[PDB]
UniProtKB/Swiss-Prot annotation:
Protein name per UniProt: DNA-dependent protein kinase catalytic subunit
Post-translational modification as stated in the protein's UniProt record: Autophosphorylated at two clusters, the T2609 cluster and the S2056 cluster. Autophosphorylation induces a conformational change that leads to remodeling of the DNA-PK complex, requisite for efficient end processing and DNA repair.
Disease involvement: Immunodeficiency 26 with or without neurologic abnormalities: A form of severe combined immunodeficiency characterized by reduced or absent T and B cells, recurrent candidiasis, and lower respiratory tract infections. Some patients show dysmorphic features, severe growth failure, microcephaly, seizures, and impaired neurological functions.
Positions carrying N6-acetyllysine: K105
Highest taxon of source: Eukaryota
Species: Homo sapiens
Quaternary structure and partners: DNA-PK is a heterotrimer of PRKDC and the Ku dimer (composed of XRCC6/Ku70 and XRCC5/Ku86). Formation of this complex may be promoted by interaction with ILF3. Component of the core long-range non-homologous end joining (NHEJ) complex (also named DNA-PK complex) composed of PRKDC, LIG4, XRCC4, XRCC6/Ku70, XRCC5/Ku86 and NHEJ1/XLF. Additional component of the NHEJ complex includes PAXX. Following autophosphorylation, PRKDC dissociates from DNA. Interacts with DNA-PKcs-interacting protein (KIP) with the region upstream the kinase domain.
């Protein structure tokens, strides 16, 4: 409260101490956690984008944050992602997005692990405010950048990679087709191709992926819902709720639909 009125010129030095590498402890440690839990309780009175030095310090802050958010045990990991989410929902204006570093997380070709996931959850964090990935500035060669992201659904060992992956590609398609873009169909037919290849050996993976996409971008199901009509008696149990939920996704555009739901024996289910 000594610093609650007098806070407007009190954001640079603590962020220097925070985002500096030498900080008395590695990782997102207790000092920088209480720094961010302090400074984010300054809404309205304080704003960082009035100087570009605070912008590059905020980029350095979130960059070092990105360098250290794994921390194997679960509760502090969710705490790390909570700190990330709070920063990019409070400040989020001078924090012009550092891409070209999430590629280093989700581009890990080891198809027997779960190390790739942190970049995907971060990708959901940065995206589902408003913001699109693949800025023109980051030199990633877009096809590779999106191909390595969309390959993540054959990673069928842990759910934490591919469930989150399909769930954020739904958000990708939703944001890139609410407003216009050239780069839409290059990814839409890409994720269509990925589902087209993965759909034929493992079916529950296909149906969970389609469920997660239809959470945010509906109409991709129509080119598979006829095959979901094909496999409507092929599942029984926990998968069936998601099986019927992808049906619920596309009903209002549909026309006949009751002959098919009838012919797959609606009364007993």
């Amino acid at each position: 409260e000594v610093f609650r009125p007098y806070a407007k010129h009190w954001l640079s030095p603590l962020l220097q101490l925070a985002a500096s590498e030498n900080n008395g402890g590695e990782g997102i440690h207790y000092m920088v956690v209480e720094i961010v839990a302090t400074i984010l309780s300054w809404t309205g009175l304080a704003t960082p984008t009035g100087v570009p030095k605070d912008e590059v310090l905020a980029n350095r802050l979130l960059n070092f944050l990105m360098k250290h958010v794994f921390h194997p045990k679960r509760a502090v990991f969710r705490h790390n992602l909570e700190i990330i989410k709070t920063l990019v929902e409070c400040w989020k204006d001078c924090l012009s997005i550092p891409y070209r570093l999430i590629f280093e997380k989700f581009s890990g070709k080891d198809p027997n692990s779960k190390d790739n996931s942190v970049g995907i959850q971060l990708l959901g964090i940065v995206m589902a405010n408003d913001l699109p990935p693949y800025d023109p500035q980051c030199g990633i060669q877009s096809s590779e950048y999106f191909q390595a992201l969309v390959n993540n659904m054959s990673f069928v060992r842990y759910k934490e990679v591919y469930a989150a992956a399909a769930e954020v590609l739904g958000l990708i398609l939703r944001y890139v087709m609410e407003r216009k873009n050239i780069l839409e169909e290059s990814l839409c037919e890409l994720v269509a191709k990925q589902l087209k290849q993965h759909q034929n050996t493992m079916e529950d993976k296909f149906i969970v992926c389609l469920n997660k996409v239809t959470k945010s971008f509906p109409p991709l199901a129509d080119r598979f819902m006829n095959a979901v009509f094909f496999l409507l008696p092929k599942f029984h149990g926990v998968l069936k709720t998601l099986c019927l939920e992808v049906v619920l996704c596309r009903v209002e555009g549909m026309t006949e639909l009751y002959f098919q739901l009838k012919s797959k024996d609606f009364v007993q289910v």
